[PDB]
Design a protein around this ligand. Structure first.
Ligand SMILES: O[C@@H]1[C@@H](O)[C@H](O[C@@H]2CO[C@@H](O)[C@H](O)[C@H]2O)OC[C@H]1O
Ligand SMILES: [Zn+2]
Ligand SMILES: [Zn+2]
Length: 196
């Protein structure tokens, strides 16, 4: 955003900015700095981070087709994803467009694949126990769609992923937020992403 960046945010916060929901979450490790830009733009910069997840989108999500653009420059473990939550049942989900040094599906049984938006995604389910959530400390399932050819930018037809997860037997609840998220853990980097 250059100058166009808003005030720097360094602790967890949510809101709506220029018509877009934003969620910034950090566990407090290292330094993580988030800024809202014009329209659907956000930037995040991080240095020896703990866990963080940040981005812009909608709350609630409604399975829309997402177009996003920008750049994503991690040095270490980071994911660029369409990211969100359902409630009842509580579910955290990821449509991973790129990951850097660590595959977040490691150790999970692959449940199938989905072909959409000129790529192929492998489908996984995991579980988090006594973990942070949009409802507080909780246990919940995580659903994953992990693109086989990593990219930064393009179109994500989220309904195709949700349909594929349901066909694989993965139940979704009522939609809470859905954002184009930059995530990191014990890494550094920067990203500047615009949700169109
Ligand atoms: O909205 C926030 C969530 O993004 C946060 O989720 C943690 C995000 O990192 C993931 O690796 C974890 O599985 C997940 O627990 O929880 C807090 C909530 O306010
Ligand atoms: Zn990659
Ligand atoms: Zn490629």
């Amino acid at each position: 955003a250059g100058a166009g960046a808003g005030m720097e945010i360094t602790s967890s916060e949510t809101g709506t900015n220029n018509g877009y929901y934003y969620s910034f979450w950090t566990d407090g490790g290292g330094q993580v700095t988030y800024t809202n830009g014009p329209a659907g733009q956000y930037s995040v910069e991080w240095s020896n981070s703990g866990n963080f997840v940040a981005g812009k989108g909608w709350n609630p999500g409604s399975s829309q087709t997402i177009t996003y653009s920008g750049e994503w420059n991690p040095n270490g473990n980071s994911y660029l994803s369409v990211y969100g939550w359902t409630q009842n049942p509580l579910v955290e989900y990821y449509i991973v467009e790129s990951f850097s040094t660590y595959d977040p599906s490691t150790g999970a049984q692959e449940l199938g694949t989905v072909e959409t938006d000129d790529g192929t995604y492998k489908i996984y389910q995991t579980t988090r126990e006594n973990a942070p959530s949009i409802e507080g400390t909780a246990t919940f399932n995580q659903y994953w769609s992990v693109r086989t050819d990593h990219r930064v930018g393009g179109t994500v037809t989220t309904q195709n992923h949700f349909d594929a997860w349901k066909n694989a037997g993965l139940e979704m609840g009522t939609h809470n937020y859905m954002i184009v998220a930059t995530a990191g853990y014990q890494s550094s980097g920067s990203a500047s992403i615009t949700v169109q």
